Write a protein that binds this ligand. Structure first.
Ligand SMILES: NC(=O)c1ccc[n+]([C@@H]2O[C@H](COP(=O)([O-])OP(=O)(O)OC[C@H]3O[C@@H](n4cnc5c(N)ncnc54)[C@H](O)[C@@H]3O)[C@@H](O)[C@H]2O)c1
Ligand SMILES: [Mg+2]
Lengths: 405, 405
């Protein structure tokens, strides 16, 4: 019989990556898997506009309920896409809605590896980008001269109801930005446990990255991480052979971390950072490793009941330049590994959360990865890695289908 | 007849770098250049303490007057140095006082090259780090649950004197940072002119780097840059053959620029960014190129009279490990190029801003660089680049001196 897929959210996009995933689902998944449990959504930019973003709200509900989401690369309906695709209004990135809706802890941005193919980092690197806070949720104005004041009124504790001044300053420029944001740090306890748990299992040395020497409000990010590490993990990292006895958890300034990403070509490390530092440093990570497609973008949140909500995504876009070449009838070569890693992660997590056909699902997802890697080893991978004698998009997809059983 | 040095501020530090520059002043500069106009200051940590920091104030006043400063690496008299150096008390970093005193608008962070020795970037790269604003001067608090409010009362325009809300948010975490900052943008006009002028002279393509797509308050950094470019430079870039007719100034997202720094190993570009982004990106630049010592750290400010105050530094410390080796009688090999590039920059600026012996100064500073590079090509540079067969600190210094004429 076919494998019974556990409940999972599937978010379809458009252009080259949707064409490729249509093929993968029809030729790899569907012959071997009953996908009745998959709740599919059309997140075309046109469909987000056509539905007034009801589809995005349905995605968020489904994700809370099901706990496991695969999302394809999607076209954010920016002002430029309104012009091109002929939309009625512009819509922001869906990332904010997912990160708030699923109580986001981290975006895991890990290097993707192929056994037998050398990429930039020799051994796995793990990266946690704190999923919330910082300038991504700032309030701001662009102003001239005047008086800026920031007040805070606690709602509990000894000084509940008493307003204090956080900051007061005089703007003396005709043009200035004024900006306020917050970092919520309660979930850094969860982040730390998630990060250090991962790093231990991977046997990689963990590092915490901030600008806390100068941006002193970040100190709790470090302190929370170090406390969890010392109390709950340090002896375990010693016993795993990862760190020497007496070796303390290392703090890296963001300034240093940017240098270490270029230097540490052997890999075998983990970093955790705030939202913006994570955004920047993981794109650097992508470039050093190979390209955006070879780093994960795995959002990890938590339901109110304590079950982890995991969404998985490739880190490249929809690849319109290649899609246009397809409709002109020219040969394409899209590497589907990024998206497949995400689908694997989503299918695996769905199987674990719901305990539906768990053994057979892990065996099948493992088999997909193994077959993919073996083809790359054999010189039958896509042209990004195997050169001009590498396979086209369709040849690669058919090659895997023939190998799968 | 010696070259007449223009008025210049010389700030001496301590340890190995002061020892080296003492030899360079004695053996390269003084025999060939009348340094009567140099005002020299002793910025040993011990001397900041011994003068109750009058020496720092004297440096700042002289720099305002003279407009050209070379500063050696220095040891900030932190709490850690008090016991070690026998100080009465600790003293803060001088950098803020220098930046405010000299109306700093940018820290210029440029790659340093040796003709015939391959470093990371083949051709010069220029970087401007905006020297003001951002989280470096943020007000902040670490708080629990409560209401945060940011208001602004403009002092000009039709709504002058009326308070408006910039931001309002409810803090729902037991542990959170709340942060307010501003970006003064009036001086981006001056920064733009300086940046594009330098890029034109260098014949490199300029790029502006921000996160303005998400951090929308940054938009004016781009708008001011692009407006100055279009109105005052684009035609000249076309005339010089640096850019083609109809080629527009490019904006790079900060997380794209981190990838470009690894990718663009040919060099031959310039970037301008906000304070924090510059701080992080220029260290990445250091690591790609070679190490921090091969990138400049030159503060540039605008004098009230319209001319520029320029201060030049190397981006390494005082090299205490070599100083200790030196004092035990062991061989050393300090590469003085970073500091020499700084001194060259200061002497050239002094000659140019005061219009004193420009041709002879520029010829002499060019000669020092030409002699240095040739020695490295012969394998008679310092041991960092030339291996164990390279010259010692003193041998290298004497090798240059005998070739200067
Ligand atoms: O003080 P800190 O922590 O910033 O370190 P620093 O920059 O004073 O020195 C750190 C390390 O880099 C080396 N180094 C730095 N500048 C050098 C130069 N000009 N030539 C040769 N070696 C150099 C030192 O020998 C030392 O091992
Ligand atoms: Mg830095």
């Amino acid at each position: 019989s076919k494998i019974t897929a556990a409940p999972m959210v599937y978010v379809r996009g458009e252009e080259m990556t949707a064409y490729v995933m249509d093929l993968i689902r029809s030729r790899w998944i569907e012959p071997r898997v009953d996908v009745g449990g998959w709740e599919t959504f059309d997140l075309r930019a046109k469909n987000r506009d056509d539905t007034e973003d009801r589809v995005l709200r349905d995605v968020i509900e489904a994700g809370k309920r099901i706990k496991a989401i695969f999302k394809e690369p999607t076209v954010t309906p920016t002002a430029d896409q309104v012009k091109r695709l002929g939309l009625r209004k512009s819509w922001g990135s869906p990332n904010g809605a997912m990160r708030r809706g699923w109580n986001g802890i981290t975006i895991s941005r890990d290097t993707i590896h192929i056994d037998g193919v050398e990429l930039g980092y020799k051994k796995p690197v793990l990266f946690e980008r704190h999923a919330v806070g910082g300038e991504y949720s700032a309030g701001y104005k662009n102003v001239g001269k005047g008086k800026l004041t920031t007040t805070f009124t606690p709602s509990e504790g000894p000084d509940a109801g008493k307003t204090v001044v956080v900051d007061e300053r005089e703007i003396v420029d005709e043009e200035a930005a004024v900006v306020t944001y917050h970092n919520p740090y309660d979930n850094v306890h969860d982040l730390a446990r998630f990060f250090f748990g991962r790093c231990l299992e991977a046997k990689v040395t963990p590092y915490v990255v901030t600008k806390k020497t100068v941006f002193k409000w970040q100190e709790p990010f470090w302190q929370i991480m170090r406390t969890v590490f010392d109390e709950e993990f340090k002896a375990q990292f010693v016993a795993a052979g990862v760190m020497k006895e007496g070796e303390e958890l290392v703090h890296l300034l963001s300034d240093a971390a940017t240098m270490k990403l270029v230097q540490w070509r052997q890999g075998g490390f983990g970093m955790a950072a705030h939202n913006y530092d994570g955004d920047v440093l993981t794109d650097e990570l992508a470039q050093v490793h190979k390209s955006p497609g070879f780093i994960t973008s795995n959002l990890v949140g938590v339901h109110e009941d304590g079950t982890l909500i995991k969404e998985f995504e490739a880190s490249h876009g929809t690849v319109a330049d290649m899609d246009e070449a397809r409709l002109r009838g020219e040969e394409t070569s899209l590497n589907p590994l990024g998206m497949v890693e995400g689908l694997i992660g989503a299918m695996n997590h769905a199987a674990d959360v719901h305990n539906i056909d768990r053994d057979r699902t892990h065996a099948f997802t493992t088999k997909m990865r193994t077959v993919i890697h073996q083809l790359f080893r054999e010189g039958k991978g896509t042209r990004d890695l195997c050169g001009p004698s590498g396979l086209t998009t369709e040849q690669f997809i058919d090659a895997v289908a023939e190998r799968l059983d």
